Every structure is written in C-alpha cells, then in structure tokens.
Design an enzyme around this catalytic site. Sequence first.
Site, PDB file in Angstrom:
ATOM      1  CG  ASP A 180      -2.028   0.982   1.157  1.00 37.54           C
ATOM      2  OD1 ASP A 180      -2.255   1.496   0.046  1.00 37.54           O
ATOM      3  OD2 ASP A 180      -2.631   1.264   2.218  1.00 37.54           O
ATOM      4  CB  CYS A 214      -6.182  -1.320  -4.155  1.00 35.52           C
ATOM      5  SG  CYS A 214      -6.654   0.407  -4.571  1.00 35.52           S
ATOM      6  NE  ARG A 220      -2.598  -0.883  -2.662  1.00 32.29           N
ATOM      7  CZ  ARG A 220      -2.769  -1.653  -1.587  1.00 32.29           C
ATOM      8  NH1 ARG A 220      -1.980  -2.704  -1.427  1.00 32.29           N
ATOM      9  NH2 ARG A 220      -3.727  -1.382  -0.694  1.00 32.29           N
ATOM     10  CB  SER A 221      -7.596   0.804  -8.160  1.00 33.96           C
ATOM     11  OG  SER A 221      -7.830  -0.348  -7.346  1.00 33.96           O
ATOM     12  CD  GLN A 261      -4.315   8.447  -2.465  1.00 37.11           C
ATOM     13  OE1 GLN A 261      -4.153   8.544  -1.235  1.00 37.11           O
ATOM     14  NE2 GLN A 261      -4.903   9.399  -3.190  1.00 37.11           N
TER      15      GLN A 261
HETATM   16  C1  LIG Z   1      -3.272   8.229   3.844  1.00 37.52           C
HETATM   17  N1  LIG Z   1      -4.610   8.143   3.283  1.00 37.52           N
HETATM   18  C2  LIG Z   1      -5.449   7.281   3.851  1.00 37.52           C
HETATM   19  O1  LIG Z   1      -4.997   6.542   4.721  1.00 37.52           O
HETATM   20  C3  LIG Z   1      -6.873   7.177   3.368  1.00 37.52           C
HETATM   21  C4  LIG Z   1      -7.353   5.730   3.235  1.00 37.52           C
HETATM   22  C5  LIG Z   1      -6.561   5.011   2.163  1.00 37.52           C
HETATM   23  C6  LIG Z   1      -6.179   3.681   2.318  1.00 37.52           C
HETATM   24  C7  LIG Z   1      -5.436   3.070   1.311  1.00 37.52           C
HETATM   25  C8  LIG Z   1      -5.088   3.733   0.136  1.00 37.52           C
HETATM   26  N2  LIG Z   1      -4.341   3.139  -0.834  1.00 37.52           N
HETATM   27  S1  LIG Z   1      -5.022   2.219  -1.987  1.00 37.52           S
HETATM   28  O2  LIG Z   1      -3.922   1.892  -2.903  1.00 37.52           O
HETATM   29  O3  LIG Z   1      -5.661   1.090  -1.332  1.00 37.52           O
HETATM   30  O4  LIG Z   1      -6.072   3.075  -2.591  1.00 37.52           O
HETATM   31  C9  LIG Z   1      -5.475   5.076   0.013  1.00 37.52           C
HETATM   32  C10 LIG Z   1      -6.219   5.703   1.016  1.00 37.52           C
HETATM   33  C11 LIG Z   1      -6.579   7.168   0.816  1.00 37.52           C
HETATM   34  N3  LIG Z   1      -6.993   7.828   2.059  1.00 37.52           N
HETATM   35  C12 LIG Z   1      -7.487   9.065   2.035  1.00 37.52           C
HETATM   36  O5  LIG Z   1      -7.852   9.633   3.058  1.00 37.52           O
HETATM   37  C13 LIG Z   1      -7.573   9.740   0.687  1.00 37.52           C
HETATM   38  C14 LIG Z   1      -8.125  11.163   0.769  1.00 37.52           C
HETATM   39  C15 LIG Z   1      -7.961  11.809  -0.591  1.00 37.52           C
HETATM   40  C16 LIG Z   1      -9.018  11.784  -1.500  1.00 37.52           C
HETATM   41  C17 LIG Z   1      -8.880  12.375  -2.760  1.00 37.52           C
HETATM   42  C18 LIG Z   1      -7.675  12.978  -3.114  1.00 37.52           C
HETATM   43  C19 LIG Z   1      -6.613  12.990  -2.206  1.00 37.52           C
HETATM   44  N4  LIG Z   1      -5.412  13.546  -2.483  1.00 37.52           N
HETATM   45  S2  LIG Z   1      -4.627  13.483  -3.882  1.00 37.52           S
HETATM   46  O6  LIG Z   1      -3.187  13.703  -3.587  1.00 37.52           O
HETATM   47  O7  LIG Z   1      -4.738  12.143  -4.517  1.00 37.52           O
HETATM   48  O8  LIG Z   1      -5.202  14.499  -4.795  1.00 37.52           O
HETATM   49  C20 LIG Z   1      -6.755  12.396  -0.956  1.00 37.52           C
HETATM   50 CL   LIG Z   2       1.236  -2.984   2.595  1.00 35.22          CL
END
Ligand SMILES: CNC(=O)[C@@H]1Cc2ccc(NS(=O)(=O)O)cc2CN1C(=O)CCc1cccc(NS(=O)(=O)O)c1
Ligand SMILES: [Cl-]
Length: 297
Positions: A180, A214, A220-221, A261
């Site tokens: 992640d 994900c 990741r998606s 991300q």
């Molecule tokens: C540190 N962020 C988090 O823990 C939470 C939960 C979480 C857990 C895992 C993953 N990774 S993934 O690969 O499984 O998608 C992402 C997120 C995004 N989160 C957020 O709070 C995102 C908030 C957000 C929404 C939209 C845009 C942004 N920023 S941007 O830099 O992408 O423009 C941030």
């Molecule tokens: Cl991980």
Amino acid sequence: EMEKEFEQIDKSGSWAAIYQDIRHEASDFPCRVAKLPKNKNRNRYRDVSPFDHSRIKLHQEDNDYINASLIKMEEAQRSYILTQGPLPNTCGHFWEMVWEQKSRGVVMLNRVMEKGSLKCAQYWPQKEEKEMIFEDTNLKLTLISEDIKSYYTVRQLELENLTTQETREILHFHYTTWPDFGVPESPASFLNFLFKVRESGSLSPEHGPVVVHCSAGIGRSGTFCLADTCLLLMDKRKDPSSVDIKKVLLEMRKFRMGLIQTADQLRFSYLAVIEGAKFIMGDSSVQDQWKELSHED
Ligand SMILES: CNC(=O)[C@@H]1Cc2ccc(NS(=O)(=O)O)cc2CN1C(=O)CCc1cccc(NS(=O)(=O)O)c1
Ligand SMILES: [Cl-]
Ligand SMILES: [Cl-]
Ligand SMILES: [Cl-]
Ligand SMILES: [Cl-]
Ligand SMILES: [Mg+2]
C-alpha cells in the site's frame, strides 16, 4: 513526449511538484449519496467516496449505494469499475455489482491484511468445497480453480444468480505483493501481470467493465488503470508520442477522486508505459523477458 519528460523530471528531481500539480488540477464533484447517513457503514474510509455522477448504482432494491465508480475512457474505448475492498456487510453488494454490470474479471491489488489491519473482506471462497451464499443479494459464488504464482494468483470463480439459476465464469487476478502507498517490484512484474489480465479476454469490449480494487480503490487501482489506458491509446494509434499521461490521469480523475496516491506511483506509471510501449510497437520478445524478470515461478 513521455520519455523525454520522464528524463527531465528525473533530472530536475521534480516528481513531487508534478504530482502536486495533478492534485491541484483534479476535478471536485459532489458525493452527496456517499455521505448520506444510511450509507456510512457502506464506506471503508471517511475521505474516499464515489462522485455522484459516476457512481455505480445497484439494481436491487431499496438502497442502491456502493462505493464504486465507472471510469469511462471515451477516447480509449475502455471502461473500468474502481471500487474499495468490500466490507463484511458489502460483499453481497460487490457481487451484485459484478453480476449487473456484466463484468468478466476482477483485479485485486491489495491483500486482505496489510500492516496489521483488515483492508478488505474475504469476499471470495478459498476452498472449492466451501462456497459462499450472499443471501441479501441472492448470489452463490464457488471457487473452481486457482493458479498460484510467486507474486500473483489467478482464480476461476463461478457466480450464480440464484433467482434465475444463470451462471457466469468470473476470473480473479490477485496481485499479492504490491505494498500500500508503494509500487510494484519492477515494470516487468507489473506488465507481466497486466498482460495476464489482458490475455484472459477480461478487458474485451464484449464484456462489462473489469472491476479493479485495492483497499481504497484509488492508489494502486489508479496506477493499474492509468498504465493500461495509456498503453491502449498508443496501441490504437500505433503512436507512443500521441499519449499525454498527465492528461489521461486528469481525465480518469473526473470519474473517481484520488487516483494514484503518491508521486512515486506516478513515476512508476511512466516507467511501465514506456516499457510496455516496446511491446505495443512490435518487439514481441519483450513479453517473455518480463515473464523471466518477474520470477513468477
Ligand atoms: C493516507 N490516506 C489514507 O490513509 C486514506 C485511506 C486510504 C487507504 C489506502 C489507500 N491506498 S489504496 O492503494 O488502497 O487506494 C489510500 C487511502 C486514501 N486515504 C485518504 O484519506 C484519501 C483522501 C484523498 C481523496 C482524494 C484525493 C486525495 N489527495 S490526492 O493527492 O490524490 O489528490 C486524498
Ligand atoms: Cl502494505
Ligand atoms: Cl490476501
Ligand atoms: Cl501485516
Ligand atoms: Cl474488512
Ligand atoms: Mg482443497
């Protein structure tokens, strides 16, 4: 052109600034449905929601809400559904969505447990003889077979609509070693896996959109779908120079927030597209090289 830009960003050390520009320019649309009180337990993360305009609506049958978004890439002529890892109470909704949307493939880029915590429900059966019934949505789901590689597993599932007794084969492509907020081990490992998904027919325009997830369904998606769409765009045109990766990402972000991300996931997407372009433009032999480099056996 992407490789010239890549070099200039790398040489100036400006991935953070480039990524920040994307964050700045990204679309902001309402997510009113996602934020209704009745939907709070359907969201894994407070700050990750589908925009109303592009959310997938469930067809049964009192609450149509699922945290999932249709990424419809008009120019590329490919669509994806990006969704969060299902919760204990939304596994039935997830499979309902797969059925209603006519998806043939599910791409999973996270593990059930990451960093000590449960980031996705166990939404598919691990053993052939222990099928799952989703009584809320009247679906049954059976493991048919699995092909376990070193860093990914492909499973054949049978999903049955119990209301009609129709069955469909769903292919599940599970990348087990993508950390992640991190990147794949190499462009080769990523591209070997993306081409496995491609080779399966799961992305055919004859099927519904592939489901990609994900844990939040954005980092990741987003990385996976950005690379796939960029490769498809250059394949249609047979012209790597025609593809503007940042424009493509901003287009994808019209459909779901937060796709990609970290700055290094953006950098990785460039690496993967530049490498994959070698195959698109006719060096077939590179595919075997990725398989070797990925150490999938
Ligand atoms: C540190 N962020 C988090 O823990 C939470 C939960 C979480 C857990 C895992 C993953 N990774 S993934 O690969 O499984 O998608 C992402 C997120 C995004 N989160 C957020 O709070 C995102 C908030 C957000 C929404 C939209 C845009 C942004 N920023 S941007 O830099 O992408 O423009 C941030
Ligand atoms: Cl991980
Ligand atoms: Cl897992
Ligand atoms: Cl752990
Ligand atoms: Cl969970
Ligand atoms: Mg057994």
